[PDB]
Amino acid sequence: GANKTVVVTTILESPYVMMKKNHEMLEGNERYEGYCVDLAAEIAKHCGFKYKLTIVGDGKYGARDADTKIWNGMVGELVYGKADIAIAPLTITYVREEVIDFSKPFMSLGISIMIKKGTPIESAEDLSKQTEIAYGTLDSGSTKEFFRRSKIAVFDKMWTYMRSAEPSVFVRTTAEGVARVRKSKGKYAYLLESTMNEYIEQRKPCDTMKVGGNLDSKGYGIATPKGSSLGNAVNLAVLKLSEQGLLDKLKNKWWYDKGECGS
Amino acid sequence: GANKTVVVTTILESPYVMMKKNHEMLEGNERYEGYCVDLAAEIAKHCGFKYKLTIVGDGKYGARDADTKIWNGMVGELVYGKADIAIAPLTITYVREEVIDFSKPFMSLGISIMIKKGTPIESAEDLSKQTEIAYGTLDSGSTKEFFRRSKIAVFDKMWTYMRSAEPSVFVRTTAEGVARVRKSKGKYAYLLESTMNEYIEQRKPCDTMKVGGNLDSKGYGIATPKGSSLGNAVNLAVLKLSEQGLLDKLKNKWWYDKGECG
Numbered sequence: 001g002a003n004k005t006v007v008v009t010t011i012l013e014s015p016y017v018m019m020k021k022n023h024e025m026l027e028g029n030e031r032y033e034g035y036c037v038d039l040a041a042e043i044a045k046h047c048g049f050k051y052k053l054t055i056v057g058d059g060k061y062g063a064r065d066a067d068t069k070i071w072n073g074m075v076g077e078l079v080y081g082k083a084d085i086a087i088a089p090l091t092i093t094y095v096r097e098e099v100i101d102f103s104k105p106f107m108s109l110g111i112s113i114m115i116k117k118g119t120p121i122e123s124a125e126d127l128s129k130q131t132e133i134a135y136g137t138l139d140s141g142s143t144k145e146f147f148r149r150s151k152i153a154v155f156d157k158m159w160t161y162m163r164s165a166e167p168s169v170f171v172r173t174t175a176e177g178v179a180r181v182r183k184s185k186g187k188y189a190y191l192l193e194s195t196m197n198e199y200i201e202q203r204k205p206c207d208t209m210k211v212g213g214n215l216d217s218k219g220y221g222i223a224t225p226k227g228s229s230l231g232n233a234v235n236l237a238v239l240k241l242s243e244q245g246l247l248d249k250l251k252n253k254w255w256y257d258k259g260e261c262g263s
Numbered sequence: 264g265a266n267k268t269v270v271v272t273t274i275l276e277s278p279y280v281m282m283k284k285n286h287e288m289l290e291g292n293e294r295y296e297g298y299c300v301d302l303a304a305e306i307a308k309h310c311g312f313k314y315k316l317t318i319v320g321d322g323k324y325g326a327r328d329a330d331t332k333i334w335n336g337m338v339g340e341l342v343y344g345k346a347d348i349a350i351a352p353l354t355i356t357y358v359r360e361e362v363i364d365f366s367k368p369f370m371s372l373g374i375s376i377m378i379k380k381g382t383p384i385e386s387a388e389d390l391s392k393q394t395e396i397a398y399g400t401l402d403s404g405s406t407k408e409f410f411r412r413s414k415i416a417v418f419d420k421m422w423t424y425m426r427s428a429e430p431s432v433f434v435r436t437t438a439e440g441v442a443r444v445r446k447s448k449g450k451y452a453y454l455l456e457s458t459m460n461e462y463i464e465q466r467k468p469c470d471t472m473k474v475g476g477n478l479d480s481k482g483y484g485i486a487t488p489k490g491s492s493l494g495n496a497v498n499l500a501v502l503k504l505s506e507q508g509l510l511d512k513l514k515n516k517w518w519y520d521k522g523e524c525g
């Protein structure tokens with residue numbers, strides 16, 4: 001039938017999507033800015049659709065409740081038909097690929113360690129062999145699931161600690177984890193994706209640091225409900241923009257051109 | 264219908280697929296070893312099929328002839344039905360995605376610069392601003408197409424030089440490019456994927472070096488003919504192997520555990 005406006009689900013996560021300082025004087029898609037706002041405009045132009053950005057109602061990425069088997073977050077909005085596409089830093093994972101479709105990745109990343117500068121930690125092994133410094137992850141995301149499922153000795157030891165730590169070492173948002181690092185005088189380290197870690201490293205007050213190599217290698221993809229007619233075009237659009245260098249330009253724009261910790 | 268042995272097309276490219284030292288007394292899949300031989304075995308086990316490794320007839324990855332529009336290499340073997348799956352360091356690209364299916368990537372890479380140690384080159388910009396040191400790429404692959412299509416000033420300038428340089432700066436195989444670097448006393452630099460560059464850096468005689476950052480960011484995928492019934496399972500198998508750490512284990516096995524340069 002007639003063309004319909006595509007409902008995009010996304011998440012308030014810097015620098016991917018944020019509200020403009022003057023958002024109350026703006027309308028619709030113009031209220032937002034960031035890497036994924038820029039990417040959404042390009043995907044829509046190349047695939048030939050109009051769209052509406054919406055922020056995921058529960059503020060989560062997406063996980064399946066073991067008891068109810070209900071998906072939450074952006075994944076849930078696609079699974080239950082509340083959104084037509086997700087354009088966000090949404091990690092491609094096996095369990096998600098079983099229930100939604102993903103484009104080829106638009107950004108590479110791996111799990112990484114964020115410390116407050118001066119913390120005597122250089123690696124995941126370092127974290128796993130000590131107890132003075134607490135550490136945790138985001139809730140309802142792919143990093144928590146990585147540790148929950150890992151059979152690698154170091155990462156399983158970390159999970160055994162994190163799942164039982166009291167008070168909870170897990171946080172509701174990336175911003176909460178960063179704030180916990182910054183206020184803990186070196187006694188909390190945060191496990192988060194290298195993309196978000198590298199962004200925060202270039203933000204005032206310039207007191208955090210990414211240390212060690214990444215723990216895994218994966219990517220973010222644009223997600224659609226399984227079998228959606230948009231998937232083929234969106235996948236080709238990602239590859240076209242990748243090959244033309246747009247994805248590299250956008251990363252530089254939102255990570256480094258606007259960095260606050262020097263050149 | 265009944266299960267059929269899956270025909271795998273792949274390519275002799277170290278350390279992905281190589282003939283074993285004792286290959287002349289071996290038969291079938293046992294003749295070969297490497298990262299992609301191990302990966303094929305894992306994919307087959309998780310997807311539940313038997314398979315036969317075959318080396319692509321023309322020794323190429325795959326490009327489309329501009330005049331006839333016919334695909335060569337492994338891509339062609341999939342397009343024309345000569346193979347059921349390609350398990351190789353085959354780069355995911357737009358033009359290929361139009362004619363074959365790719366899994367999610369099993370390895371990350373980008374285009375990179377290989378020099379003979381001591382060559383006064385640190386970047387693509389350095390190459391583009393001089394003429395004493397020649398440089399080129401593999402034929403019939405994704406790196407040549409990258410330069411052919413780039414509108415980035417430095418890379419467009421490099422393509423203008425490469426497309427007309429005499430003698431030809433292009434090579435038919437990665438091994439020919441590496442040999443050209445090693446024998447040119449620093450007057451040839453080779454543009455190739457970072458995976459292959461980093462492998463060669465750890466091989467005797469330890470006289471090459473990867474320099475500069477990568478020029479792009481992309482990945483290798485397992486490829487199937489469009490609409491093949493194997494595609495969905497193979498894609499999930501790649502993600503499972505990724506999440507289990509198996510892909511990382513295999514890279515360490517074939518790049519670094521037996522590196523020869525310390």
Ligand SMILES: CN1CNS(=O)(=O)c2ccc(CCc3ccc4c(c3)N(C)CNS4(=O)=O)cc21
Pocket residue numbers: 092104105106107108109217218219220238239242355367368369370371372480481482483502505
């Ligand atoms: C940014 N970009 C443009 N798109 S593309 O040419 O398809 C492409 C392919 C691969 C990567 C390297 C980073 C990565 C992303 C995703 C995964 C990985 C590894 N591996 C290694 C396991 N598989 S995965 O899909 O989680 C980046 C990339």
Ligand SMILES: N[C@@H](CCC(=O)O)C(=O)O
Pocket residue numbers: 061062089090091092138140141142143144191192193
């Ligand atoms: N990108 C992650 C969220 C961040 C994290 O888990 O570290 C996801 O899609 O679940």
Ligand SMILES: N[C@@H](CCC(=O)O)C(=O)O
Pocket residue numbers: 324325352353354355401403404405406407454455456
């Ligand atoms: N991996 C490349 C071949 C190597 C190259 O072009 O540098 C391809 O799939 O074409």
Ligand SMILES: [Cl-]
Pocket residue numbers: 266267268
């Ligand atoms: Cl058979």
Ligand SMILES: [Zn+2]
Pocket residue numbers: 019023
């Ligand atoms: Zn506000």
Ligand SMILES: [Zn+2]
Pocket residue numbers: 024
């Ligand atoms: Zn209002």
Ligand SMILES: [Zn+2]
Pocket residue numbers: 042045046
């Ligand atoms: Zn565009």
Ligand SMILES: [Zn+2]
Pocket residue numbers: 008009010054055056057077082083
């Ligand atoms: Zn929504």
Ligand SMILES: [Zn+2]
Pocket residue numbers: 122123125126
């Ligand atoms: Zn240590």
Ligand SMILES: [Zn+2]
Pocket residue numbers: 132
């Ligand atoms: Zn103390």
Ligand SMILES: [Zn+2]
Pocket residue numbers: 156157159160
């Ligand atoms: Zn355990």
Ligand SMILES: [Zn+2]
Pocket residue numbers: 185
């Ligand atoms: Zn202090």
Ligand SMILES: [Zn+2]
Pocket residue numbers: 204
């Ligand atoms: Zn600030």
Ligand SMILES: [Zn+2]
Pocket residue numbers: 210
């Ligand atoms: Zn760093």
Ligand SMILES: [Zn+2]
Pocket residue numbers: 305308309
């Ligand atoms: Zn296995």
Ligand SMILES: [Zn+2]
Pocket residue numbers: 419420422423
């Ligand atoms: Zn040109």
